[PDB]
Nucleic acid binder design. Structure first.
Lengths: 46, 271
RNA sequence: AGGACCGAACCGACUAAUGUUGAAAAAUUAGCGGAUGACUUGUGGCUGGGGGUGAAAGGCCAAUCAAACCGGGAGAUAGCU
RNA sequence: GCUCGCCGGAAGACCAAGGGUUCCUGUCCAACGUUAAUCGGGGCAGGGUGAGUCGACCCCUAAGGCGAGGCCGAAAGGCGUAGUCGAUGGGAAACAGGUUAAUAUUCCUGUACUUGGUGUUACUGCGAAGGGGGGACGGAGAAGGCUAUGUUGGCCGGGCGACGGUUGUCCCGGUUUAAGCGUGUAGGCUGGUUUUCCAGGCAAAUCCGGAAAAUCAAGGCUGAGGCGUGAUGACGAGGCACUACGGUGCUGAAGCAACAAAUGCCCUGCUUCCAGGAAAAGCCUCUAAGCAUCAGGUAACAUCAAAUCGUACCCCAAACCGACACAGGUGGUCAGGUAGAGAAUACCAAGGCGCUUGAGAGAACUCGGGUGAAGGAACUAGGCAAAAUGGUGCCGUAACUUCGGGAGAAGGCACGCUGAUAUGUAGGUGAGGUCCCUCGCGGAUGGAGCUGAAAUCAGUCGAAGAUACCAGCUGGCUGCAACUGUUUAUUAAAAACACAGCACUGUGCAAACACGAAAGUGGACGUAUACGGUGUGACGCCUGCCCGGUGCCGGAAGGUUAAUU
RNA sequence: AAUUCCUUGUCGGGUAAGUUCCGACCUGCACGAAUGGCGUAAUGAUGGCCAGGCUGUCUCCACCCGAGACUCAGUGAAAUUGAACUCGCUGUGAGAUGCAGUGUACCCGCGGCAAGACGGAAAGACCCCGUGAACCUUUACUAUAGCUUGACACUGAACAU
């Protein structure tokens, strides 16, 4: 059966990547929350 | 010509074709082509603003000259061509100076017929002059509403307006809708009628033919649920309310013209 | 020529049996429908929650939809267990 | 290692996506592996991915995204111009062989090719963020000409048979060779050449386009494949010396022809149809501003450079998505033999597997199958299921019908093998030879050889000849919907939704309408034979009466009536 | 009749027998003409009915081939579970393994069946309740976007009646 996750690193980075997060006010707030929480992986970049 | 196909299959019984052998059986003039990407009825916000639009055959836009501002230069018709962007056929005309342009094809315009624009042009089909010099009571098409911007009225397959009066700097027109509108007596109009009159007698014959034109299916509204449409649902076919648009407007007589800006060029709105 | 015919791939899912702590959170087996088209498919893109999209079933919108998910208001309120 | 069995339009091979060392070697068996395990995609260690030509990067753009200014918006921010990003598309060039335990069009051998920089020489009008050309494009169909590939024969080498026969019309195997360069063919498109003039191509233009003359018909472009060269080579079944029987040096014969033939190439073609079929750059040209005993441009030769990243391995799967070593899902490419219409199906090749618990027993019952006396739907909600029909050709085929259909209606006959017709026919292919010739990949003639149906007659075996796999049950009455289609992913595929068609109504363009506090966008680069909404739902015969109510469209005398005053 | 309550309407057809089916009758409970009416060739994995053929669908099952079940070795779950030394009957308490009376019954396994343990599974979807929700409807109430009316403002000039 066709499942939900069909991986594509291009669509992954364009949708949740670092530059995609830094391109909007709210995306930058996501990084701020993850930095404050102490996340080791801020994004899905690599 | 109008021809009824034979019922060799369900979907060809009622199809009626409009074949015209005079049309060019070749490629169009490339310098006058442009990309025309489809929209699906969606606007810059990506929302469906006009329903029932989607798919269809790829189309290239032909740059048609609706202004006809090359005055004093005769032009000969090279060939009649099929235009997918409109119901009427277009004509590739060659000016004496070597310039080529597309124009709407009038009723009886053929290859080799000469045309001309300007005030000193002759009163014959295809010629474009200001309505000041057009005799009253004549039939014209591709009429300008404001001098110099381009024809906007009577551009469809077999449409035409009739100049019924000329009072001053204005002239009165009988539009194909029956509306009696008046425009300035400096707007250019082309003599004759747009020639594809048989375009109305065409019968698609099947659903797929409408999808070729980019027309998506129309869901009625009584077949929906109330959350989707006022006509909504009901156990069976009830429909116990006044006919109404989506978004709640009558659709059965309610006039919705609320311009009030012109309010002057209209005389006999219609009917 | 054909939203033409028979029929593989491909796309579908009408019947039956099995399975039902399954091999599988919807499949398998035998048959079944369409199969040049309103077809199908890869890649990328757009539409964002009272909104989208919908050949319209209240269907679908990440195994979740008569108003998604996450967080917050929040220890909502609960004359009920 | 010898057998057996399975896949073989894959259960084989090569990739993308994705994963990210799972690849190779050695070593280990606690855990992981649904059992054991010496084994492993497990643990530990080491090793392994070599590019001017493959791909990415790069140049160019599509959808779309961002967006200097700008417009708009309480703020956030939204839209969008110039621009700049963005492939799933366009854009220069490498082939064969050999080689590693693991990489290769990347290393080696051989043979090549492309784009740039610099320099020299010679001849020179060079120059764009501009103009034009080109790039540049649909569906279906039709053949024709070719190749991949295959078959047979010939040739070379080997073999003479575990059991009757097998020195012959016998058996096994091999018979391979690229890009590039040269030739420019089948065939496709186009009439060329020169001069003069011009409201056009934002200015210019020798270019494009247009006009009027003269002169010739042979000019050119495109173009598979073939042939030649590449190649006195490489490869090569098998040998000769080493041979730890793990492999290495040398040598290594034949290496042709015919036929058949693609869904691949000529073909971005040809024909035809309507639903009328991307963009930009590279590239080819045109000149402007400007620069000329310069600079630049063209050709030849020489020389330099072509970086950087990816390259292992899996990739219909045990390595990706599914929590699993999960009967699921996953795009592209390669496409052998016999039979066959066929990529169906059966059996096989290359190659790869026997699916990570086995042994025994041969109860009930369950699952998946086979056969069945007599009867034959008596079963049951219901012929559910099963059984049955099944192919080709010929004959033949009703009601009804929108004259297309219904229809493969129904139903009936014949199908194998052998021989002859005919030592292999009709047909297809086509050599030598001959003749012609603008002497070429030419034409005509010629018919060798190769290939090869179908039919008839006769004979013959079996219970059965479309013998297997494969492969319509049919007919009659009737409701609903015209039809093909669409739908509740995951209990409903339908009489429901669409549908062509019909009608009403709105909309004169800054259209109605819709998304948007707005700008603006869609509608539409459309203009009433258009667009939106509503209902109905092919077609045919039709669609009657009622405007009191509600709504809508109009109208006015009067009454009533808001803010305001 | 996809519509007919009475109703298996009545008659006829088909069957030995037909609440279905087909054809008529009309007494249309409660058809009806674009929320279309009546027909309609073709089409349909569509609904209903009747035939031929076919058969293990059945009368009525029998045998056989395989995969499980069974035994051995290895590995090794699950739901459930107040505790159990966990029988029948009649009665009792509102359908008893557990109380009363009585009967029967050596202790423990394996293979099977599924009547009960009101068996397991999911705080019943029916029903009612809550001054609980959520969506939906409308000539329910109150509001409101939008559309629309006018006044003032952006907004001025003269002329005539």
């Amino acid at each position: 059966m066709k499942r939900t996750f069909q991986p594509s690193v291009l669509k992954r980075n364009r949708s949740h990547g670092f530059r995609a997060r830094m391109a909007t006010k709210n995306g930058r707030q996501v990084l701020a929350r993850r930095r404050a929480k102490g996340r080791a992986r801020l994004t899905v970049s690599k | 010509a109008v021809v009824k196909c034979k019922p060799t299959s369900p979907g060809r019984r009622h199809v009626v074709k409009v074949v015209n052998p005079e049309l060019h059986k070749g490629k169009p003039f490339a310098p006058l082509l442009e990309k025309n990407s489809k929209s699906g009825g969606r606007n810059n916000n990506g929302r469906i603003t006009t329903r029932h639009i989607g798919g269809g055959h790829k189309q290239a836009y032909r740059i048609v000259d609706f202004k006809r501002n090359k005055d004093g230069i005769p032009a000969v018709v090279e060939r009649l061509e099929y235009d997918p962007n409109r119901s009427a056929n277009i004509a590739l005309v060659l000016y004496k100076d070597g310039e080529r342009r597309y124009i709407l094809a009038p009723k009886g315009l053929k290859a080799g017929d000469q045309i001309q624009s300007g005030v000193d042009a002759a009163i014959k089909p295809g010629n474009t002059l200001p309505m000041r010099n057009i005799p009253v009571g004549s039939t014209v098409h591709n009429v300008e509403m404001k001098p110099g911007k381009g024809g906007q009225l009577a551009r469809s397959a077999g449409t035409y307006v009739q100049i019924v009066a000329r009072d001053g700097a204005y002239v009165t027109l009988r539009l194909r809708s029956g509306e009696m509108r008046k425009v300035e007596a400096d707007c250019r109009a082309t003599l004759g009628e747009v020639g594809n009159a048989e375009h109305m007698l065409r019968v698609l014959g099947k659903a797929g033919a409408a999808r070729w034109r980019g027309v998506r299916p129309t869901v009625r509204g009584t077949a929906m649920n109330p959350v989707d449409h006022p006509h909504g649902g009901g156990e069976g076919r009830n429909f116990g309310k006044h006919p109404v648009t989506p978004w709640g407007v009558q659709t059965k007589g309610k006039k919705t013209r609320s311009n009030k800006r012109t309010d002057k060029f209209i005389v006999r709105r219609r009917s």
